[PDB]
Amino acid sequence: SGLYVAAKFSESTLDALEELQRSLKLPNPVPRDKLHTTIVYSRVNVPYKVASFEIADKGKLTVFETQSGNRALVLEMDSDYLSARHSYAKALGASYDYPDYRPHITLSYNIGVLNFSGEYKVPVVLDREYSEELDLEWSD
Numbered sequence: 833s834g835l836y837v838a839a840k841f842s843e844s845t846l847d848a849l850e851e852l853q854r855s856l857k858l859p860n861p862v863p864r865d866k867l868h869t870t871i872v873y874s875r876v877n878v879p880y881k882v883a884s885f886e887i888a889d890k891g892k893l894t895v896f897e898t899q900s901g902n903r904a905l906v907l908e909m910d911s912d913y914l915s916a917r918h919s920y921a922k923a924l925g926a927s928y929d930y931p932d933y934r935p936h937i938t939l940s941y942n943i944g945v946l947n948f949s950g951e952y953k954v955p956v957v958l959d960r961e962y963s964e965e966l967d968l969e970w971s972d
């Protein structure tokens with residue numbers, strides 16, 4: 833049920849993200865295959881039509897808590913592309929679980945007690961969007 837949509841990244845973007853994870857000595861890094869950015873997180877399903885663009889060129893580190901109560905480190909971006917794709921889903925009827933869509937790439941879903949801050953230049957190039965059912969229990 834529901835609908836989840838995310839974007840996957842080009843090889844060069846993935847390399848840069850992994851370099852970022854290594855630079856930060858991040859615990860529980862998201863594995864390469866699981867790096868993504870959510871576009872839709874909807875409890876209702878709509879006929880969202882999935883999509884060489886750089887979609888973002890920088891981001892800031894932000895800590896978000898997860899459902900399980902762990903601390904996740906994300907690279908939070910301003911992305912006109914991702915925000916417009918999120919709004920397309922909304923126009924179709926999709927729901928979202930936060931008051932603001934804040935596009936991000938989760939770098940670790942469990943950073944323990946550590947703290948991080950920074951502003952990075954990362955060329956974020958999308959390879960493809962994918963859609964599937966909403967998996968409330970998804971993990972990396």
Ligand SMILES: Nc1nc2c(ncn2[C@@H]2O[C@H](CO)[C@@H](O[P@@](=O)(S)OC[C@H]3O[C@@H](n4cnc5c(N)ncnc54)[C@H](O)[C@@H]3OP(=O)(O)S)[C@H]2O)c(=O)[nH]1
Pocket residue numbers: 836869870873896897898899900904906930931932933934938964965966967968970971
């Ligand atoms: N305060 C605040 N927190 C925010 C804000 N935006 C987000 N967060 C939180 O940040 C967490 C760390 O990412 C996060 O924790 P979750 O326990 S709900 O993570 C579960 C995660 O599974 C991912 N996933 C992969 N595939 C599927 C699938 N098929 N269905 C469902 N999920 C899927 C997905 O990536 C997703 O996280 P996401 O953040 O991309 S929506 C959020 O709750 C905000 O605006 N504000």
